[PDB]
Amino acid sequence: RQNLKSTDRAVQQMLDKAKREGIQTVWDRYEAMKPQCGFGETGLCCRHCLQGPCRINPFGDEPKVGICGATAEVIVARGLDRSIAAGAAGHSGHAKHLAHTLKKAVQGKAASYMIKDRTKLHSIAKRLGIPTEGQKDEDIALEVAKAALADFHEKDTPVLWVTTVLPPSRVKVLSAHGLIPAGIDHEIAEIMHRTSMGCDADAQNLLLGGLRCSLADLAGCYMGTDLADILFGTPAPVVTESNLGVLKADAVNVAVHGHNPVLSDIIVSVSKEMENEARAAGATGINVVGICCTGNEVLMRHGIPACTHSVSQEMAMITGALDAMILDYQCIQPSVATIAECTGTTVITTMEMSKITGATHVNFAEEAAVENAKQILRLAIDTFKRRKGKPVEIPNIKTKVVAGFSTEAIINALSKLNANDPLKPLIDNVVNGNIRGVCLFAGCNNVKVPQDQNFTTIARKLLKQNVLVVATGCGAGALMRHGFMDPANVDELCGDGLKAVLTAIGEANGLGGPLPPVLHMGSCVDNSRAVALVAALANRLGVDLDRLPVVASAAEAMHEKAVAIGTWAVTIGLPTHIGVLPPITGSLPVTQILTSSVKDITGGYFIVELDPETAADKLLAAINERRAGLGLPW
Amino acid sequence: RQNLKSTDRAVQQMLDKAKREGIQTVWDRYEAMKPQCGFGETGLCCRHCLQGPCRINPFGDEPKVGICGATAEVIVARGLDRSIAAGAAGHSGHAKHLAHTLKKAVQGKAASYMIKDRTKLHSIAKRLGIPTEGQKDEDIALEVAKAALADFHEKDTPVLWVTTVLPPSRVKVLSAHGLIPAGIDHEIAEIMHRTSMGCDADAQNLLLGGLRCSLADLAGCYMGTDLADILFGTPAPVVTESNLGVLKADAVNVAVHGHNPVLSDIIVSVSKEMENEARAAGATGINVVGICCTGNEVLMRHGIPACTHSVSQEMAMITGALDAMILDYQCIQPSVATIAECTGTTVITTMEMSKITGATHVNFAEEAAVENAKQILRLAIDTFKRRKGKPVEIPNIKTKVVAGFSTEAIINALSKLNANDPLKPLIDNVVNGNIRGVCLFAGCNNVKVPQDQNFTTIARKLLKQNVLVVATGCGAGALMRHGFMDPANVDELCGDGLKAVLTAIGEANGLGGPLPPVLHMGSCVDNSRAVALVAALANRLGVDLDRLPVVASAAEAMHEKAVAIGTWAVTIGLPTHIGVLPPITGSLPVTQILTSSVKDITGGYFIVELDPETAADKLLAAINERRAGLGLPW
Ligand code: SF4
Ligand code: SF4
Ligand code: FES
Ligand code: FES
Ligand SMILES: [Fe+2]
Ligand SMILES: [Fe+2]
């Protein structure tokens, strides 16, 4: 019964194919892992020194405490902090890569890269205090790249990709609690230090450290978006398609998978130049498709169709038509390298610190980006030739996707209703009730949850109650694959007030129809775009973020990066739902801090709820409490 | 039967007292943890995402692979890499603290701190390429502190506290394999990134990353020693005592515990000024004693007696005479805060990122160091007053300890036998067989091993075979508490050739007797001093470190810091014994790399051996293989 594994019908069809062919999947590896360890599930396990492993029974008798004396609340808080630091290390490493790429580009060392969005470059420079008047663009960009790199270490200022992106009143709240990061890698290292044996052993102190490290993660996200927009262009509305039916039996199908547009953006451009070489090999052309966030990046900027996401990534290979899978880093199931032996796909790694045994490695260098891309795409063309005459099974299933809603694009769309005060039309309709509030869906799928079931169940309940829904990452992936980014579904999905607003904006932008039911704001680093929108609304209203009717939902969370994002959503002031259990329930004191008493520190809080209907009710209650706090009807 | 817990008789006596008083100890918490989880013991557990916990059966049937596809060798290598990064985060955080302290001192912001060792300052400056001619000392020091801080991030040079401290030929070997760190916190963050879900998944690639991060740890160690020597003085030979009998019923007994001399050095000086205030309270004075590495720091520089170490730290409190325990960070069992409720001890934390629930916190600031020290010591005096008329049980057990053998001190001692070529007398006696080789004992005690049993068993076997033995950290602690730093024990412990050499050096230095059987080279960061000595020998001989008859033994290892140290010992070219099982045996491929094929990369290798007699035989075989490689008899 494949609908217990995934609610996506294309995924179900490929699970049937994998089963009859004897190809083990993520769902099979999960079944083989059951029952999972309940010490790990509850957070009551520690391996931070060679006296371990230590564990604590959630209930009953001994063991009650770690060998060194570490209590349940210390063990739980230390493990959580390490997860936050690991997420911060991923988002900001991504950002550091892009900062080095921009520096190389403007120093004449990588001519495949350039300043594509000069408007974005100048606005970032102004936000940071970098002078622009009478400066060459390449010198402004060099200063921006140097400022980005400087935020990784201690200096005379705090992390500017925190303090220049939130309103002063929020910065003041955070500073009063010691939560502003001093440097991105500085905080990651401090976490690893304080959580090592015989160091920090006070749950509140540990968790304050975690909140601060989560803001280092936010800075890496915001830096990643800023730099990718400079290099590759700020997204604007675009129309494309999603799901496995975007693969084409007659073409060389190339998936870009992983995270950084420094890689996927060049593949997209070079693939167009290699069309005739692909035709010489018997193909119609090169069909680049997206998986995971790298896919989101090229979907947002270029309309490249999204093949699949997260938990179902192996299924693209099961079709038999995926000639290459080009990988950077993060969220790539290493099973892809073994499955490729069965399906024929050429899996190619490109980054020095992210290799997979059995996959071909092609060192990417920005200085040689075009030549490296051609070498990679020629491996793909060779693989296509090997499947001449082989039948494939591509499910004929795809949805229409309108996307590209950067914060700049949302403001521009609203400006068609009020040119000199673009945020006011949105605020007006929150006040009059046509928009109840805003919910950001973020983060992964997780094999424990039938794929997409929480995202779609929650989104349906909120849309019917007139909530404006925005989405990133594989939450955007889930919603796009189920039709939530097709404006043809507005009538079925949206309450009357929300429909009226989406229609007024869309028609004022010439569409003759509404905006889509859900606004796709991009990749996981592009959660920073939602921060920019919410901060702009707070500044326009003269209130802090913890008074706005805005919530977040990591409805099917998996990666350490999603834990970090959820934690900074709480830290900036949002009620934040998580739809899978993080390893915290073994400590009531820690759970109480994260779901209740953190409200008194930052105004945000976690809502841990595995039942999606109940989660939607709790998210609506959180929105309505904010409305009442502003004196609004609800 | 307390000798199964500790071979230290003072510890045994306090275990009997804890038992009759119902005070739970580390050994009781260990017993309550048995049997420990064998997935964790073997390394076959992963909690790096919210699909976990995942585990792999070492043998048998499913589960055989992680849910995402992570193999046993990936899971084992990722966990090990995180442990190395966490150790690096501790040693280098320590170093960063000292760099900020030096900067503040020379900028006029902390007058309790100063340049105490001008010779060391100028030599470090010269080693780094910083000009000294016609510069003020405060400006040279500012440049040294800024260079230290710069090594934490990427810049135009690699980490100079690696590349300027090893011989060029070793740097070249490491560079050829990509192992030179680019920045200390940069590498820590890269590790956390590459080991997060869906990133690096090739065991060799992961382990190369770990070796590089271990060199970031070495840099933090060497930086810590350098900066502590500038601020507090380079050690020279000193005589003191060790074990619980250094406590005095009639005095205010104050333990300094944790790591950084920025704290313990001021306590020592201020305590002398407060003698009359202590006498006013009915005490004879303030008796400062050491625990763990902070204790080693003040023992090496000032002859402060060492009370206890590592695993037995709770026993100092059980005496009833410990009025205060002043903590910084690292290796402090958090049980001390609960035990204090029973024993009366005032436990005081001082660092913002290392608090313990139930312990009094007194914020230390360098700018207020003397005033903070007096506040702390007045809490101790008040506590002494509360135990007026209370009997105490201080075991009347202590050993004589000769220590203070910095590398500068060892060279100076040798220079009395050859003034213009001080290393030659040591080399001469290696060649003629009076010295078989050199063994460094490093790292912790571990509750799994009867306390000190591996250190003493191995040391006895090596000393009888004419090995020169040096020691740091709680390996030095174990050996000092069992008489291995008392020159009166040379006749009993040392082979005839080693005795002849220790006697010739000692008599040439005026002692009328030998150097002690083991040379104490200091704290855990001061393992860097052993690197300086070995590098100087390599440079004098014109060979790389992997040709010298030098080995290391982390005979009872516990902390993530000890894993990092063991790993950089392997990376710089040494055969390196570890006497407890690291979580690697669940993967034969990983174990084979770490114990065998790494020899072909760095020339070093791990020797995993839990039986100490067998470990000594394997260490001697490793020394003798090096002798034969140099064409020497053995
Ligand atoms: S840090 Fe404490 S709780 Fe964790 S493994 Fe070590 S002894 Fe056990
Ligand atoms: S990273 Fe892979 S092996 Fe580790 S917990 Fe997640 S699914 Fe399991
Ligand atoms: S005891 Fe299972 S996660 Fe450690
Ligand atoms: S299953 Fe015990 S350490 Fe995870
Ligand atoms: Fe992602
Ligand atoms: Fe130590």
From Swiss-Prot, chains A, B:
Regulation of protein activity: Inactivated by O(2).
Cofactor: [4Fe-4S] cluster; [Ni-4Fe-5S] cluster
Keyword Translocase among UniProt keywords: no
Taxonomy, superkingdom: Bacteria
UniProt cross-references to InterPro entries, sorted A to Z: CO_DH_a-bundle, CODH, HCP/CODH, Prismane-like_a/b-sand, Prismane-like_sf
Entry binding sites for [Ni-4Fe-5S] cluster: H259, C293, C331, C444, C474, C524
EC number: 1.2.7.4
Keywords: 4Fe-4S, Cell membrane, Cytoplasm, Iron, Iron-sulfur, Membrane, Metal-binding, Nickel, Oxidoreductase
Reactions performed catalytically: CO + 2 oxidized [2Fe-2S]-[ferredoxin] + H2O = 2 reduced [2Fe-2S]-[ferredoxin] + CO2 + 2 H(+)
Record: residues binding [4Fe-4S] cluster 2: C46, C49, C54, C68
Any GO BP annotation: response to hydrogen peroxide
Cofactor note: Binds 3 [4Fe-4S] clusters per homodimer.
A Pfam short name: Prismane
Entry note about domains: Cluster B is an all-cysteinyl-liganded 4Fe-4S cluster; cluster C is a mixed Ni-Fe-S cluster which is the active site of CO oxidation. Cluster D is also an all-cysteinyl-liganded 4Fe-4S cluster that bridges the two subunits of the CODH dimer.
Function: CODH oxidizes carbon monoxide coupled, via CooF, to the reduction of a hydrogen cation by a hydrogenase (possibly CooH).
Protein name listed in UniProt: Carbon monoxide dehydrogenase 2
